[PDB]
Structures are given as structure tokens and as C-alpha cells.
From a paper:
Alpha-B.1.1.7, Beta-B.1.351, Gamma-P.1, and Delta-B.1.617.2 variants of [name]-[name]-2 express multiple mutations in the spike protein (S).
The Beta-53/Beta S complex structure shows attachment to all three RBDs (2 up and one down), and higher resolution analysis of the Beta-53/Beta RBD complex confirms that the antibody attaches at an epitope overlapping that of antibody S309 identified earlier (Pinto et al., 2020). Like S309, Beta-53 makes a substantial interaction with the N-linked glycan at residue N343. The Beta-53/Beta S complex structure determined after incubation at 20°C for 30 min may cast light on the mechanism of neutralization. Despite the incubation temperature being below physiological, a substantial fraction of S was no longer trimeric, suggesting S destruction as a potential neutralization mechanism, as proposed for other non-ACE2-competing mAbs (STAR Methods) (Huo et al., 2020; Yuan et al., 2020b; Zhou et al., 2020). The mechanism of neutralization is unclear; however, there is a suggestion from the cryo-EM of the complex of Beta-53 Fab with the trimeric S protein, that at room temperature the Fab may destabilize the prefusion state of S.
Residue numbers in the entry:
A (entry chain L): 1 to 109
B (entry chain H): 2 to 120
C (entry chain C): 298 to 515, 517 to 617, 638 to 643
D (entry chain A): 27 to 65, 82 to 121, 126 to 143, 165 to 171, 187 to 242, 260 to 297
E (entry chain A): 347 to 385, 389 to 396
Write the structure that this text describes.
């Protein structure tokens, strides 16, 4: 399988700042990566797919980048409704879809 | 684009169970409906996926001989079935879709999830 | 202008040709209510191996090739025997949609009369192929890190494949003198070989999904392009497009009764003398619109410039008039 | 057991209508004056011509299975019911006294030909007085049904009335359509020098 | 191998049937031409 590892485990960012999350794969996954948002008590919501394309209906402040084994999710101008757990899942067609452990975004203090 | 799952289930260990998830508004008869488990405090973990038209499974190695995933394209429904339930199976199970866009894939909808309690 | 001389001597000169010009146009396609399933063939999760290329039959539906032509995703769309732009109108008595996957450098091998391993042992088109070939890179779907060996291709085919022939045989190819009896080894090779599609390979080895649309043009049209059927007009010189058959003539009621199967009838001239309207099974005969030779009868320009005209082999209707034989 | 086929193997090649026109067509036709078996499973071969003398419509229909073990789909016409399902037939199918299409004293002629994966079922029904064999009277078969099934089609069998099996070959056939769009005669351009001259 | 020899075969008639038929060749791989259809403006043999 292709293990997915995210970083950091948890962070703390004040509103208006820029949050950064990293995702690493064991072996390349080209660009078949997707970032999700799972607010407490809510089902996961897609944010970025293809490692760079923003899902329709999502605020433009979210952005994805990277390629190969390393990918990054950037949340510019963090908002009060952006506090959730973000995962990175690869969906290579002829392969088992693996999942990362996730990263938690909280209020800086 | 819409997926509807079944209601929450409570079963004793060892009892068989099957949860359903009906899809609609798909691009073509050849899409990818997949199941994901979420324990109360754990993270997301992929289990398997089917293409109902082909009914071709890709069970995860950690879930190969634990659950059976089937489909019925006449009703455009997918089913996740436990032959014997155990306490560890207590979790929320979601069904997601992955449509084909020629160049690449695209996940459109995410199921609301069904809570299963084995006790 | 015909004589090319200013002076015209006495006589009759066949100056011009008089053609009754049609004013109205009629378009009547089959009244079919359905959309042909292009997405299922194209938007498919996984494609079959080239050696075992899949075939879908499209029928009893209204096709719209405008979307396919307009789409920019298709890397290479090459139509032989038909114009991709004009596909919107042509009807088809039968449509085949072949699907498979090859590598980029083999895309050329899928062409009428082409040669090579793919064309010779996997998928061969006829010399008179009448269809389109649409190929698009599938590096994001048919390639994995470490090599996607799902897709196969026939390499050592004892018998060269005939056009539109699929060979799924897995018999060990006996390249030597002694037989193999189903036993592999030296001079005994498995006929199929797998593409190890990897995302890091060059475009030449990168996967490509190929769809071949083969059309049969003749019989009732199961599939026709998108068009708006209009009301027909009896007894009028008009253009007409019946089931994709294009013509210009008078559409008239015909006493002659076709056989139930018969749709298009042609006489010794081989022209479509009569047609069967798709909306209603009414046999409409077709007669060429009145055509003749305008012969200018002129006395010598020296004597005068008054000039008479003679429309040949026409009645004094379509044109101090004299009707002669 | 064989009998003379005479000239009772002519059908309409195309759907075109040609009034009072002699037309030349190079196509699969039953050879004229060719021995035909007189009545198991009969291979489809190039073509098939089946003439039934069932006065009471005894023959319900036919089956078309090359594998003969239900592995492959087979045409099932029974009498009018037509089905193209993957039927599981008995070892000796008969009638007692994944479907892709469904439709619901006397000599009956039918021509079965599979070309480009297209099944054609032509028919001709006429009163007869000669029990022994086919009358030596010219007849035509209009296309009863045409199903572009696309199946392989290499063998066939009947359903139970003697019957015959002929074969079609490429034969340039001069066909004489009459004013009523009816074929009254036909010439096989390879029967003999006289036919070639005609 | 660092000083691999090179012979040129020319002005002769080549028969590759014997080489292919030999069963003592542990490796025999052809690139750009099938060995069967070997029956060229110049030939080199590196050893
Ligand atoms: C296979 O599935 C993909 C994914 O849905 C299809 O791509 C989508 O195709 C539609 C049209 O068929 C595109 O909509 C177009 O939008 C533009 C405006 O951007 C509009 O001007 C057009 O008239 C049309 O409505 C849609 O953008 C496109 N999606 C993507 C992500 O590119 C594809 O058409 C399907 N192919 C088959 C053969 O089913
Ligand atoms: C489809 O039809 C072809 C042509 O009739 C069959 O080819 C025959 O195959 C058998 C064994 O597979 C051979 O013994 C014959 O010699 C073949 N015929 C010819 C003309 O070469 C083929 O078998 C058929 N396939 C199926 C599944 O029925
Ligand atoms: C010309 O037309 C008139 C009436 O339209 C008809 O009486 C006459 O027979 C026609 N003659 C010819 C030669 O068509
Ligand atoms: C054509 O057939 C009809 C009835 O079948 C008959 O009345 C007519 O006379 C036939 N044609 C000729 C030229 O006799």
C-alpha cells in the first residue's frame, strides 16, 4: 500500500492568518490526491482534488499544491468556521485507496 | 447527484448485518462507490469500492476477509455486509462516489453515514 | 456571350439551361426520443485490453456527436470517410463503438490499412473503414507507480487478424519446430504481453484510451443526429433530407405500394425514385424538377434585335406564347 | 436422402423496390437444381434454406446455438414469439402437445443467413399438393424479420414434417421484378452456358 | 567487455535459421526486427 502521513498532528492559528498542512506518501502518487474537511459531527467534505483543483462551491481561500510524494494544503485568511480535521486521500485507479491520520486546526492562544 | 444510506443499526456480536446506500444522478453506469469506516475517535479508513455495472470489488487488504460489498444496478444500490459482527465493528460507515471524467476521476458526493453499534 | 461575338447571325443558339429553382426545404428524421449512451462507452472506469477490445452497439437512440467534436479533452480525433463537423446531420443504420487501451506510439497503428503489432494482431481496420477514431491519454487512470499490468496485447499471433476480428486465444505460440502442447518454454511463448504502465514513462509508452466509432451507411436508420423534423410539402419543387438521404425534387403522393420491408426504391436510373417518410409510412415519389434548354431564336442582328426564346421539352407553365411539340 | 431443389430458393436481396425491372445482383443465393437433404443438428455453414411441409404448422420454430450446451446465446423463434435470451435448452429440445430482444398441404420456406452479424429470417407460405417433395414452382421470399443480432452463428437445429437444408453461395442472379413488385422468375448466371448467355 | 571485438559481415549470404534453431543459446532477444523474418546493407557482429 501507499501510506499517507500528515503533519502537524495539531496546530493553532488565529483568524486571518495562513494555515499550512503537509501530506506525504510512501512512493509516488502522481497527482491523484484529495483533501477533505470533516467538521465535528459532519460528514467529510471535499476541498481540493487532483492535488491542485479547488472543488466547486468551496471558498477560494483554500488552495492545494505539490506533486509526487509531497503535497500541501494552504488556508489563507483562516475563518471561524474552518476548524475541523483535514485528511489527504489518494485514489489511484488500479490501487487501494489509502488515508492519512488527519490534522486538527484550532484557535491560537 | 445524491446518495442515501440506511438508518442506524444496533446488533449483538456475531449477528449478520447489511447496510445499504442508494445512488442517483451518476454520469454513467460505470462509476466507483466506496465504503469508509470511522470509529468514534479514530480517523478515516478506506474499506473497498465497486463499479455496479461491472460489480468488481477492490477490497482493502485490512478488510478483505471481514466484510462483503455487493451492488444492484437495477436499483443503483450498494450494500456492505458483515457475516459475523464484533464489538470492534461499532463505528460510522459512509458511502462515497467517484465518477469518471475521461481525463481523471472526481468524487462528487459523500454519504451522511450510518452508525452501527455491535453490543 | 455564348457565341463570344458581338454580332449574332440569324439562327437558333442553345444559349442557356433553365432549371426550376426550389424555394422550400424539408428535413424529416426518424421521430425517435432517446439519447445515445456515449458516456457509458467513454466515461467508463476501466477499459478492456486491446487484444480483447470491447464492442458496444448503439441503436434505437438519437446520437449527438456535436458534444464529442466540441470536447477538447480528446487528444486525437481522426475521421475517415466522414466529416467530424458534418457528423451532426448524417444518419446511420448501425453504429459500433469499439473501446480499448494502447500506448501513445501505437495510436497511429489504429488507422485504416495501418500495419504494426497492434494493427496486425490486435485490432485491424478495413481499407474502406467509414468511421472515426478518438484517442485520449489516460495516464491519470491507466498508469500506477510500479507498473499497471492490467492491460494486455497480443504479440505473437500465428494468424494475422482480419478486419474487425478479435482474438482472445491464449494458446502458447509455437515459434519452433517441435510443438508445445500447452507447455511454455523456448519456442513456446504466451501469446499475450502486458503493458506495465507507469506514470514516469514517456508519452510514447503512456496509456491512451481509444474509441473507434464505426458507422454503417445505407435501410431504416436506428441512429440519427440531432435535428428538427419539419412538415412535408406535397407538389412543390423543394429540397429534402429523408433519413439523411439528401435530394432536391418534388415530393408527391405515389400510387405504387412498397413492400412492408422496403424503404428506398430506385429505378433503372438508380436514383431514389421514391422514399418512405420516417414519421409516417407514406411512400412519396420523387420527380426531377423541370429542366430544359433555353434556346434563343434570333434573326440576324443586322436586321433587328427582337429575339424569341424556346424552352425545350417543357410546358408553358414553369416559364403571346405558342406551345409546340 | 436428397431431392432436387428446383428453383424455390429466391428471396429479395435488398429493401429496394424495382417495378418491371430486370436487376443483376451478386449475392448469396441457393444454387438452382442443387440436391438438398431430405428429412439432429445442422451446421449453419454459409447459408441455410429450410422448407417445411407442415400442413398443421407442426414446427413451432428453431434454435441457433453453436455451443449446443447453453454456453452461448441462441436465437429462439417459436410459433409468433421471438426471443434472443441466453436460454438453457434441453439435450433434445422439443415442444409437447440476459435477454436483448423479445417479440410476440402447406409449404413454408425460410432462408437463414448470418452476414456481418445480422440474422435475416425470410418466409414464403404456399398451398401445396405434392407430398413427396417441393413443388417445381417459382416462388419468392420477402424478408419476414431482420435482427442485427451480431452473434457468431455457426450451428442451428429445428423444433418438433420432413424438412430440407440447402446452402447459399455467391451467385449472380438476374431477378425479374414485375409491375406489381413481384418476382416471377430468376436466372442463376452460373447454372450453364445458356444461363450465362441469358 | 571493455575491449569488445567487432567483426563486419559483408559480401556474403547470411543464413540466420541455424542461429535461431540453436537450443544452446540461453538468451536471444531481437530489437526492431523479428528473428523469424531475418531471411540489410551492412552487418556488424560485436563479441
Ligand atoms: C464524461 O464526464 C465528464 C465529467 O462530467 C464530462 O465533462 C463535462 O462535460 C460537460 C458537457 O458534456 C461540460 O459542461 C459544459 O460546460 C460549459 C461551461 O463550462 C458549457 O459551455 C458547455 O455547453 C457544457 O455544458 C463540463 O464542463 C465537463 N466537465 C469537466 C470537468 O470538464 C464529459 O462530457 C463526459 N463525457 C461523456 C462522453 O459522457
Ligand atoms: C465462432 O465462429 C467461428 C467460425 O465458424 C468458429 O471458428 C471455429 O472454431 C472451431 C473451434 O473453436 C474450429 O474447429 C473451426 O475450424 C473454426 N472455424 C473456422 C472456419 O476456422 C468459432 O469456434 C466460433 N466461436 C464460438 C464461441 O462459437
Ligand atoms: C400543359 O399544361 C396544360 C394544363 O396545365 C395541359 O392541359 C397540357 O396537356 C400540358 N401539356 C404538356 C405538353 O405538358
Ligand atoms: C397487380 O395486382 C393487383 C391485385 O393483386 C391486380 O388487380 C392487378 O391487375 C395486378 N397488376 C396487373 C398489371 O394486372
Amino acid at each position: 500500500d501507499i501510506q499517507m502521513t500528515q503533519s502537524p498532528a495539531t496546530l493553532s492559528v488565529s483568524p486571518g492568518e495562513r494555515a499550512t498542512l503537509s501530506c506525504r506518501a510512501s512512493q509516488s502518487v502522481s497527482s491523484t490526491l484529495a483533501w477533505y474537511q470533516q467538521k465535528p459531527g459532519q460528514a467529510p467534505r471535499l476541498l481540493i482534488y487532483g492535488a491542485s483543483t479547488r472543488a466547486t462551491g468551496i471558498p477560494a481561500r483554500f488552495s492545494g499544491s505539490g506533486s509526487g510524494t509531497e503535497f500541501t494544503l494552504t488556508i489563507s485568511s483562516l475563518q471561524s468556521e474552518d476548524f475541523a480535521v483535514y485528511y489527504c486521500q489518494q485514489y489511484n485507479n488500479w490501487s487501494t485507496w489509502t488515508f492519512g491520520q488527519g490534522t486538527k486546526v484550532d484557535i491560537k492562544r | 447527484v445524491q446518495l442515501v444510506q440506511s438508518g442506524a443499526e444496533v446488533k449483538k456480536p456475531g449477528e449478520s448485518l447489511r447496510i445499504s446506500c442508494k445512488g442517483s444522478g451518476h454520469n454513467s453506469p460505470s462509476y466507483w462507490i466506496s465504503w469508509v469506516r470511522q470509529m468514534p475517535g479514530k480517523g478515516l479508513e478506506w474499506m473497498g469500492r465497486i463499479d455496479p455495472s461491472d460489480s468488481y470489488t477492490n477490497y482493502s487488504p485490512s478488510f478483505q476477509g471481514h466484510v462483503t460489498i455487493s451492488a444492484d444496478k437495477s436499483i443503483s444500490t450498494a450494500y456492505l455486509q458483515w457475516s459475523s459482527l464484533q464489538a470492534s465493528d461499532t463505528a460510522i460507515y459512509y458511502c462515497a462516489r467517484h465518477v469518471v471524467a475521461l481525463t481523471h476521476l472526481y468524487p462528487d458526493y459523500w454519504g451522511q453515514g450510518t452508525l452501527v453499534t455491535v453490543s | 456571350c455564348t457565341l463570344k461575338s458581338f454580332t449574332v447571325e440569324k439562327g437558333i443558339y442553345q444559349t442557356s439551361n433553365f432549371r426550376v429553382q426550389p424555394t422550400e426545404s424539408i428535413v424529416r428524421f426518424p421521430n425517435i426520443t432517446n439519447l445515445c449512451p456515449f458516456g457509458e462507452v467513454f466515461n467508463a472506469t476501466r477499459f478492456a485490453s486491446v487484444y480483447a477490445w470491447n464492442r458496444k452497439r448503439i441503436s434505437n437512440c438519437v446520437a449527438d456527436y456535436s458534444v464529442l467534436y466540441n470536447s477538447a479533452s480528446f487528444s486525437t480525433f481522426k475521421c475517415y470517410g466522414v466529416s467530424p463537423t458534418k457528423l451532426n446531420d448524417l444518419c446511420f443504420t448501425n453504429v459500433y463503438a469499439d473501446s480499448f487501451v494502447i500506448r501513445g506510439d501505437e495510436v497511429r497503428q489504429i488507422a485504416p490499412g495501418q500495419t504494426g503489432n497492434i494493427a496486425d494482431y490486435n485490432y485491424k481496420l478495413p481499407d474502406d473503414f467509414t468511421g472515426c477514431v478518438i484517442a485520449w491519454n489516460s495516464n491519470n487512470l491507466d498508469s500506477k507507480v510500479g507498473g499497471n499490468y492490467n492491460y494486455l496485447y497480443r504479440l505473437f499471433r500465428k494468424s494475422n487478424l482480419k478486419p474487425f476480428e478479435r482474438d482472445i486465444s491464449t494458446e502458447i505460440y509455437q515459434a519452433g519446430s517441435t510443438p508445445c502442447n500447452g507447455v511454455k518454454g523456448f519456442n513456446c511463448y504466451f501469446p499475450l504481453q502486458s503493458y506495465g504502465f507507469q506514470p514516469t514513462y514517456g508519452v510514447g509508452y503512456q496509456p491512451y484510451r481509444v474509441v473507434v466509432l464505426s458507422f454503417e451507411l445505407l435501410a431504416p436508420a436506428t441512429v440519427c443526429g440531432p435535428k428538427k423534423s419539419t412538415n412535408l410539402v406535397k407538389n412543390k419543387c423543394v429540397n429534402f433530407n429523408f433519413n439523411g438521404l439528401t435530394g432536391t425534387g418534388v415530393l408527391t403522393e405515389s400510387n405504387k405500394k412498397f413492400l412492408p420491408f422496403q424503404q428506398f426504391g430506385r429505378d433503372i436510373a438508380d436514383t431514389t425514385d421514391a422514399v418512405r417518410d420516417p414519421q409516417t409510412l407514406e411512400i412519396l415519389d420523387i420527380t426531377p424538377c423541370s429542366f430544359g434548354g433555353v434556346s434563343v431564336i434570333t434573326p440576324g442582328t443586322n436586321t433587328s434585335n427582337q429575339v424569341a426564346v424556346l424552352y425545350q421539352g417543357v410546358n408553358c407553365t414553369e416559364v403571346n406564347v405558342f406551345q409546340t411539340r | 436422402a436428397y431431392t432436387n431443389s428446383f428453383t424455390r430458393g429466391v428471396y429479395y436481396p435488398d429493401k429496394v423496390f424495382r417495378s418491371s425491372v430486370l436487376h443483376s445482383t451478386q449475392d448469396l443465393f441457393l444454387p438452382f437444381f442443387s440436391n438438398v437433404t431430405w428429412f439432429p443438428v445442422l451446421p449453419f455453414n454459409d447459408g441455410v434454406y429450410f422448407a417445411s411441409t407442415e400442413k398443421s404448422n407442426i414446427i413451432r420454430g428453431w434454435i441457433f446455438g453453436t455451443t449446443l450446451d447453453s454456453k452461448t446465446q441462441s436465437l429462439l423463434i417459436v410459433n409468433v414469439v421471438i426471443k434472443v435470451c441466453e436460454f438453457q435448452f434441453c439435450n433434445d429440445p422439443f415442444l409437447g402437445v440476459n435477454c436483448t430482444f423479445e417479440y410476440v398441404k402447406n409449404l413454408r420456406e425460410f432462408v437463414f443467413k448470418n452476414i456481418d452479424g445480422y440474422f435475416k429470417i425470410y418466409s414464403k407460405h404456399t398451398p401445396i399438393n405434392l407430398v413427396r417433395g417441393l413443388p417445381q414452382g417459382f416462388s419468392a421470399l420477402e424478408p419476414l424479420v431482420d435482427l442485427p443480432i451480431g452473434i457468431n452463428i455457426t450451428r442451428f437445429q429445428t423444433l418438433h414434417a420432413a424438412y430440407y437444408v440447402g446452402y447459399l453461395q455467391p451467385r449472380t442472379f438476374l431477378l425479374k421484378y414485375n409491375e406489381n413488385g413481384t418476382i416471377t422468375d430468376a436466372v442463376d448466371c452460373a447454372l450453364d452456358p445458356l444461363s450465362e448467355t441469358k
